[PDB]
């Protein structure tokens, strides 16, 4: 059952204990633990925010025997050589990009419900403006909400932005920074809006 892995961030934890362990640590801190999916998988559990953790599957290839750590590791469909490469090139960049998002003036802290309230209020006191903000999706670790209104009387739209190790995924493009995310969001909406106003009976 239990599995040995020779590494300073490897702990003998299930998913829950990894979260309890991390509950006191800071954002970006993590553990590596065994997977419930067999001896060719591991998990990285890392802390995004208070009570907010993500569990990332690591797939092992090139295993010298059933219990050894694969000499090639797959995280999110990208190949890495060892756990340290994962920490530096995958995890650290995911943390970097999380901080870039939460430091953005377009990001609002709080619950989905809190941020819907703010955007609805802010839409009221600025009725001829299109408004959008990002916030944390607490029910899907690793995602942000992208909420917007066209004006005071439009309905409230919610879109979904996935954090990746190389940027922010919205619809079908991975934007490398928040600034480029906002610009692409706007450009995408203008593209949809222009389409919606076309004459298909031309």
């Amino acid at each position: 059952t239990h599995r040995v892995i020779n590494h300073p961030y490897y702990f003998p934890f299930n998913g829950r204990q990894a979260e309890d362990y991390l509950r006191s640590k800071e954002r970006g801190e993590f553990v590596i633990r065994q997977s419930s999916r067999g001896d060719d998988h591991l998990v990285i559990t890392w802390k995004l925010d208070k009570d907010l953790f993500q569990h990332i599957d690591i797939q092992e290839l090139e295993k010298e025997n059933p219990l050894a750590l694969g000499k090639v590791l797959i995280v999110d469909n990208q190949k890495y050589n060892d756990l340290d490469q994962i920490i530096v090139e995958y995890l650290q960049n995911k943390v970097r990009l999380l901080n870039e998002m939460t430091s953005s003036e377009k990001f609002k802290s709080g619950t989905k419900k809190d941020v819907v309230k703010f955007i609805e209020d802010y839409s009221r006191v600025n009725p001829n403006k299109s408004v959008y903000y990002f916030s944390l999706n607490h029910d899907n670790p690793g995602w942000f909400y992208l909420m917007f209104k066209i004006n005071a009387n439009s309905k409230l739209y919610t879109w979904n932005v996935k954090l990746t190790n190389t940027g922010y995924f919205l619809v079908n493009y991975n934007y490398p920074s928040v600034i480029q995310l906002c610009n692409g969001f706007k450009t995408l909406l203008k593209s949809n809006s222009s389409k919606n106003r076309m004459n298909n009976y031309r």
Binding site: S130, N151, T158, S177, I179, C182, N183, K186, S193
Partner: peptide, 20 residues
């Protein structure tokens, strides 16, 4: 986690695009 379709013809009035 679906993205609701933009469905109206309301003119978009977003804040200006930003340089990088």
């Amino acid at each position: 986690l679906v993205n609701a379709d933009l469905d109206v013809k309301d003119e978009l009035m977003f804040s200006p695009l930003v340089d990088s």
